[PDB]
Design a protein around this ligand. Structure first.
Ligand SMILES: C[C@H](CCC(=O)NCCC[N+](C)(C)C[C@H](O)CS(=O)(=O)O)[C@H]1CC[C@H]2[C@@H]3[C@H](O)C[C@@H]4C[C@H](O)CC[C@]4(C)[C@H]3C[C@H](O)[C@]12C
Ligand SMILES: [Mg+2]
Ligand SMILES: [Zn+2]
Lengths: 72, 232, 159, 72, 50
């Protein structure tokens, strides 16, 4: 066991679970929505080409990010 | 088939005082490595030697002390007396005396010879008298054995009783430090497959390479005689 | 005469320093001892290299009985002095006594019942217990300084 | 003795086998008896277990021999 | 149609080396040779011939 091999397993699980959470948050494959689900605005072309399947424009997205930063 | 050509040592080469390369010329196919590995193992294991076994220094009780004027702990002086390479001629043990005084190194040349004892390396430095007036004297106790007999296993209980000032150094009776054998094809007009064995033995000066190989081949043929006929 | 409370009867029973916790189950045991395990890769699955010194300490009463049975020691005091000097026949008596007499090897976190196994002692020089390689998985033991406790079964029923 | 599989098979239990072997080995060690099997310098434990292997020993046999001993 | 030739009458020989203690020397050695021949010579004969 050596006490660093188990530490290795712990670190491996920690990094992998973090990596895959931050990957699942991407949702690359998606739907062409074409209009914001918050303000109905035109989600500009470049943002839909970068993130296929967005649901918020950058303004509503950053807004939501602030709140989910604090919590709730 | 017809028969094996028996090897025989064609020459020995004292390329140094200690380093030597003997040769065993005619060897049938597959006996270079048989004889070579067996010979290296016997030589590296079972060779007689003249390890210094005790020291009794005037004015010293244990190894963990300092003699006024000589700049080595008695521990270190004993460790320098371990590797002292001595070849006795007649007896299975002998008591060398080493007297010395004055500022300077104390090499193995400062020991008085019995004539039956030959110190091969008289430059081998033992201690350093670092005092104009300091003087040291030991009764080194060389003796012939084989293998490695630490003082601990040496002192089982005792002979009968050992005085307080007699230090037991760890005995390593083994003239050889290094064996290295090469088997190589031997240019013979009769057969081509025959090979010669070339043994680089690295004694410490107190074993003749011919006597080393002869003693090895004797130690081996003894056990092979124990094997020849069975018995049970 | 301190800052801490006094201990009382209810305290004398309860708590891990109480009687139930670590004096009613966890007890110090005789005929036992620990050392540092090494490999010993030549053994079979049923044996463990027991050092001669641990074996001569644990099996002391058995050896005393043997020396006074075979006449090698007149009384138990003479046998005590024999095995204290560690003479030449205490070793033959050790070989005989140990011959079919398992020793329990146990490592500290006994997560399961394979953290205890009976092995036949094979007397060895040195002071390290030699533990079979295929048993480390059960013991969760690597050979980088772990230690094992050997206990000696005393009864025929425990043997 | 390495594996006690045959001794276990003869008796058909692993605690009762220990008990039968222990009582026969106590007879053979302290109470004094003769091994029914040729002891090759074995302790009474191994002798008892080997005897149970050959069918020479079991609880029925041992109680029957106790009866015969009383009839002595 | 030439065949491999195992002239040597040993079909297999392996040796194992265990421990032995004489009375005090427990660093001793115990040779455990184990050999089978093809039939021209029994094992003990091949051993002593070698
Ligand atoms: C390191 C650990 C082995 C330690 C013994 C193995 C065994 C189970 C593994 C996780 C699970 O599979 C679920 C999940 C699946 C995703 O697809 C990839 C990430 C997750 C978090 C995995 C990370 C890691 O690989 C785990 C913890
Ligand atoms: Mg460890
Ligand atoms: Zn928007």
């Amino acid at each position: 066991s050596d006490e660093a091999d188990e530490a290795y397993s712990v670190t491996e699980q920690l990094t992998m679970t973090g990596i895959n959470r931050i990957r699942q948050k991407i949702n690359a494959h998606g739907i062409p929505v074409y209009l914001c689900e918050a303000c109905g605005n035109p989600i500009p072309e470049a943002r839909r080409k970068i993130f296929p399947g967005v649901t918020l424009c950058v303004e509503c997205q950053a807004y939501q990010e602030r709140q989910r930063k604090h919590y709730a | 088939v017809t028969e094996f050509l028996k090897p025989r040592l064609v020459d020995i080469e004292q390329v140094s005082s200690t380093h030597a390369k003997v040769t065993l010329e005619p060897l049938e196919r597959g006996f270079g490595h048989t004889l070579g590995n067996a010979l290296r193992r016997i030589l590296l294991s079972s060779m007689p030697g003249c390890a210094v076994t005790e020291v009794e220094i005037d004015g010293v009780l244990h190894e963990y002390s300092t003699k006024e004027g000589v700049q080595e702990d008695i521990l270190e002086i004993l460790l320098n007396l371990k590797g002292l390479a001595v070849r006795v001629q007649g007896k299975d043990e002998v008591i060398l005396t080493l007297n010395k005084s004055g500022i300077g190194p104390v090499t193995a040349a400062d020991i008085t010879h019995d004539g039956d004892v030959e110190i091969v390396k008289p430059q081998h430095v033992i201690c350093h008298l670092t005092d104009e007036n300091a003087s040291i004297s030991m009764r080194i106790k060389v003796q012939r054995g084989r293998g490695y007999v630490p003082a601990s296993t040496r002192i089982h209980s005792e002979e009968d009783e050992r005085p307080i000032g007699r230090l037991l150094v760890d005995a390593c009776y083994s003239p050889v430090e290094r064996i290295a054998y090469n088997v190589e094809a031997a240019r013979v007009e009769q057969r081509t497959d025959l090979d010669k064995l070339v043994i680089e033995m690295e004694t410490n000066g107190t074993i003749d390479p011919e006597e080393a190989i002869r003693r090895a081949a004797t130690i081996l043929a003894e056990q092979l005689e124990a094997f020849v006929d069975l018995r049970d | 005469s301190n800052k801490r409370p006094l201990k009382s009867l209810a305290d004398m029973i309860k708590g891990k320093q109480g009687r139930f916790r670590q004096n009613l189950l966890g007890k110090r045991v005789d005929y036992s001892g620990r050392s540092v395990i090494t490999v010993g890769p030549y053994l079979r699955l049923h044996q463990c290299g027991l050092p001669k010194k641990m074996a001569l300490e644990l099996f002391k009463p058995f050896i005393y009985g043997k020396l006074e049975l075979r006449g090698l020691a007149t009384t138990i005091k003479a046998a005590k002095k024999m095995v204290e000097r560690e003479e030449a026949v205490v070793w033959d008596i050790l070989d005989e006594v140990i011959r079919e007499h398992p020793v329990l090897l146990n490592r500290a976190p006994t997560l399961h019942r394979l953290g205890i196994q009976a092995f036949e002692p094979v007397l060895i020089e040195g002071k390290a217990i030699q533990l079979h390689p295929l048993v480390c998985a059960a013991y969760n033991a690597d050979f980088d300084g772990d230690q094992m406790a050997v206990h000696v079964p005393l009864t025929l029923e425990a043997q | 003795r390495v594996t006690v599989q045959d001794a276990v098979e003869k008796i058909g239990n692993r605690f009762d086998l220990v008990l039968v072997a222990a009582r026969r080995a106590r007879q053979m060690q302290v109470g004094g008896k003769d091994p029914l099997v040729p002891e090759e310098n074995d302790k009474t434990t191994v002798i008892a277990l080997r005897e149970i292997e050959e069918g020479l020993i079991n609880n029925q046999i041992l109680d029957v021999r106790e009866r015969q001993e009383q009839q002595e």
